[PDB]
Every structure is written in structure tokens, then in C-alpha cells.
Write an enzyme that holds these catalytic residues in place. Structure first.
Site, PDB file in Angstrom:
ATOM      1  N   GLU A 227       0.874  -1.310  -0.106  1.00 58.25           N
ATOM      2  CA  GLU A 227       0.228   0.022  -0.202  1.00 58.25           C
ATOM      3  C   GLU A 227       0.780   1.298   0.072  1.00 58.25           C
ATOM      4  OE1 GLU A 227      -2.842   1.443  -0.148  1.00 58.25           O
ATOM      5  OE2 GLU A 227      -4.451   0.251  -0.071  1.00 58.25           O
TER       6      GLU A 227
ATOM      7  N   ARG B 113      -7.442   1.849  13.236  1.00 56.28           N
ATOM      8  CA  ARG B 113      -6.280   2.192  12.881  1.00 56.28           C
ATOM      9  C   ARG B 113      -6.172   3.382  11.472  1.00 56.28           C
ATOM     10  NH1 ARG B 113      -5.417   0.115   7.438  1.00 56.28           N
ATOM     11  NH2 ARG B 113      -6.179  -1.914   7.050  1.00 56.28           N
TER      12      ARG B 113
ATOM     13  N   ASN C  62      -5.484   4.319   7.866  1.00 64.17           N
ATOM     14  CA  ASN C  62      -5.550   3.898   6.568  1.00 64.17           C
ATOM     15  C   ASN C  62      -4.587   4.792   5.701  1.00 64.17           C
ATOM     16  OD1 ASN C  62      -5.731   1.406   4.928  1.00 64.17           O
ATOM     17  ND2 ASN C  62      -7.442   2.424   4.024  1.00 64.17           N
TER      18      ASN C  62
ATOM     19  N   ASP D 291      -9.984   2.108  -3.863  1.00 64.30           N
ATOM     20  CA  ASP D 291      -9.027   1.899  -2.800  1.00 64.30           C
ATOM     21  C   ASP D 291      -8.274   3.193  -2.967  1.00 64.30           C
ATOM     22  OD1 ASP D 291      -7.282  -0.872  -1.592  1.00 64.30           O
ATOM     23  OD2 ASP D 291      -7.372   1.098  -0.990  1.00 64.30           O
TER      24      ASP D 291
HETATM   25  O1  XYL Z   1     -10.345  -2.693   0.456  1.00 62.71           O
HETATM   26  C1  XYL Z   1      -9.734  -2.122   1.294  1.00 62.71           C
HETATM   27  C2  XYL Z   1      -9.165  -3.131   2.184  1.00 62.71           C
HETATM   28  O2  XYL Z   1     -10.000  -4.223   2.762  1.00 62.71           O
HETATM   29  C3  XYL Z   1      -8.076  -2.580   3.241  1.00 62.71           C
HETATM   30  O3  XYL Z   1      -7.814  -3.579   4.456  1.00 62.71           O
HETATM   31  C4  XYL Z   1      -6.940  -1.416   2.886  1.00 62.71           C
HETATM   32  O4  XYL Z   1      -6.084  -1.075   4.261  1.00 62.71           O
HETATM   33  C5  XYL Z   1      -7.330  -0.381   2.189  1.00 62.71           C
HETATM   34  O5  XYL Z   1      -6.085   0.369   1.676  1.00 62.71           O
HETATM   35 CA    CA Z   2      -6.061   1.780   0.638  1.00 65.73          CA
END
Ligand code: XYL
Ligand code: CA
EC number: 3.1.1.17
Length: 297
Positions: free
Chosen positions: A16, A99, A101, A202
Site C-alpha cells: 500500500e 487504525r 489507513n 481504494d
Molecule cells: O478494500 C480495502 C482493504 O480491505 C483494506 O484493508 C486496505 O487497508 C485499504 O487500503
Molecule cells: Ca488503501
């Protein structure tokens, strides 16, 4: 002329937050549940890792030297030479299991990042537990809004008057009016509605023409969007389904780096996606991106 290739085969669980560091021609990124911040030197091809003590969801350049990152619910500063990590600010202290992200630095050097409840499975979590925050250069924290499911992709228009934002489980890309001098936002509205086959929005980055590229988690693609019209301009598919984020890098920001995940795949999925978790590069898109901003504190 578009070419998709797997360029780093390290099998991250959930790669990520890719960030291009032009000073060293390195890609910085994280592997969230593996609790590592990574720096990949693209010329020597070596990867260096800094282990941290909780899941780490984003990393950004720090102007005065080194890096900042979001570890657990804490904004932290990192010295890469001695690997020392210290807390700049903490958020969501009233939350039992949150948390940070996605996060990214705004054009004035403020580190925006939002939170989420911790998942038991991808997109399985207590709803509306996150908030969007930003760490200002003086280390103060502004809270923008709450009720977020999963705070995700974000960027700023080239004229610095618009902030783009994704809460993944809203299935839209949103825009706000944004004030550069104060870091304030207002007037939230939808600028793109995800189609079913595009799955979960995302990570996101803007290109030099002001169009947005969004990584589609479970959709195995990035899509290019015009936030002015609300229309998709382009789709580029990848051989991994859980594409998580993207940024521009390489010479003059002409190459796109895409992160992805292997977490949540069953045995069949792993076999169908041997490169799940690896880093991909897309060349020949015919547009460039822009340099990341560095945190000013
Ligand atoms: O579809 C999103 C994921 O499930 C997350 O776990 C990520 O952290 C997004 O960045
Ligand atoms: Ca993400």
C-alpha cells in the site's frame, strides 16, 4: 503501447501507499499487516525495510529529512539512518480498535490521513468508526469529519482548490472545495460513482492533466476518471485482483506504480494470481503524474 509488468517480486501481504522518491529513484511503500515500511531502490534493485510495532498504513516524505508514517492510530516520524521512530501526534484515542489507513501530503505540506475500524476480513468491520485528519506542520491535528467506513484514496487538484477523497465503502469518489492557506475543506459532493465490476475504490492519484486514477480493490484494474464530467476515460487491467493503490514515478513521472495484496485470497486464488502482493509498473499510459509533496513538520 501500454505495458503492465511485475517489477518487484517480494510477495507482500498488503502492499500500500506507494510514493516516488525522485532524489534516490526509490519507491517507498508499506506492507500493512507485515508492519514494515519499505524503500525499494529501483536502480540497485535492493529493498530496505524498517519494522514497526503496529500495522503501518501509509508513508510520506519528510521535507526536513527522513519520512513520516501512520502506524496504528499515530502520526510518526522516521529517521531512516538509525531507524528511530517517534510519535508526532495520536488520534482516535477513544476508539478500542481503530487504525489509520490511506494518507498523503497536501500541497502545503500537511499530512492528511484517515482512520477505520480494524477488519476481521476485507471490508468486514464496525461501520462509520473512522475520521479524516491532517497533521499540520506545527504537529497540531485537525479533524475534518467522522462517520467514515474506510478512509482511502485522496489527492488535490492542480490548481489547489479541490480535494478528492475516497471512503471505500461509499463506492464513490468525492470532491470538496479546499483552501490551500488554511487546509480547510467544504461542500462535499460525488464526482464519480463506481460501477459494479469496478468493485471497491481504494487508492487514488491525480495526473498532470487533472484526471484521477483509482485502484480498484477486487477489480484487478486501475481506472482513469474525469472529475469534471463524472465519466470514466480509461481502464487498465492487471493480473492481480486486489489492486490497492497507485502513484506516478520514474523519469518525469511517466511510469505508474501499482501495489496489490494477497491477503484474503484462498488457495485457488493464490494459484490463479502468482504475483499477488507484488509491485507492478505500467508504462505507455501517455500521460505523466506529478511529484509528491513532502510533510513540512
Ligand atoms: O478494500 C480495502 C482493504 O480491505 C483494506 O484493508 C486496505 O487497508 C485499504 O487500503
Ligand atoms: Ca488503501
Amino acid at each position: 503501447s501500454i505495458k503492465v509488468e511485475c517489477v518487484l517480486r517480494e510477495n507482500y501481504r498488503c502492499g500500500e501507499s506507494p510514493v516516488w522518491e525522485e532524489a534516490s529513484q526509490s519507491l517507498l511503500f508499506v506492507d500493512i499487516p507485515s508492519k514494515i515500511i519499505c524503500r525499494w531502490d529501483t536502480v540497485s534493485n535492493q529493498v530496505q525495510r524498517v519494522a514497526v510495532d503496529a500495522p503501518v498504513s501509509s508513508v510520506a516524505l519528510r521535507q526536513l529529512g527522513g519520512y513520516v508514517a501512520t502506524i496504528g492510530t499515530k502520526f510518526c516520524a522516521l529517521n531512516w539512518e538509525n531507524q528511530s521512530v517517534f510519535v508526532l501526534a495520536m488520534v482516535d484515542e477513544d476508539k478500542k480498535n481503530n487504525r489509520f489507513n490511506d494518507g498523503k501530503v497536501d500541497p502545503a505540506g500537511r499530512y492528511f490521513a484517515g482512520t477505520m475500524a480494524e477488519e476481521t476480513a476485507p471490508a468486514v468491520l464496525e461501520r462509520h468508526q473512522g475520521s479524516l485528519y491532517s497533521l499540520f506542520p506545527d504537529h497540531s491535528v485537525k479533524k475534518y469529519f467522522d462517520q467514515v467506513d474506510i478512509s482511502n484514496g485522496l489527492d488535490w487538484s492542480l490548481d489547489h482548490k479541490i480535494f478528492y477523497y475516497i471512503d471505500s465503502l461509499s463506492y464513490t469518489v468525492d470532491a470538496f472545495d479546499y483552501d490551500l492557506q488554511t487546509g480547510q475543506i467544504s461542500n462535499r459532493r460525488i464526482v464519480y460513482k463506481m460501477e459494479k465490476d469496478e468493485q471497491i475504490p481504494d487508492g487514488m492519484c491525480i495526473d498532470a492533466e487533472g484526471k484521477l486514477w483509482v485502484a480498484c480493490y477486487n477489480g484487478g484494474r486501475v481506472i482513469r476518471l474525469d472529475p469534471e464530467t463524472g465519466k470514466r476515460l480509461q481502464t487498465v487491467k492487471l493480473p492481480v485482483d486486489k489492486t490497492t493503490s497507485c502513484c506516478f514515478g520514474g523519469k518525469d513521472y511517466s511510469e505508474m506504480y501499482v501495489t496489490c495484496a494477497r491477503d484474503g485470497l484462498n488457495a485457488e486464488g493464490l494459484l490463479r494470481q502468482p504475483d499477488a502482493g507484488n509491485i507492478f509498473k505500467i508504462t505507455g499510459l501517455g500521460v505523466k503524474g506529478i511529484a509528491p509533496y513532502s510533510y513540512a513538520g
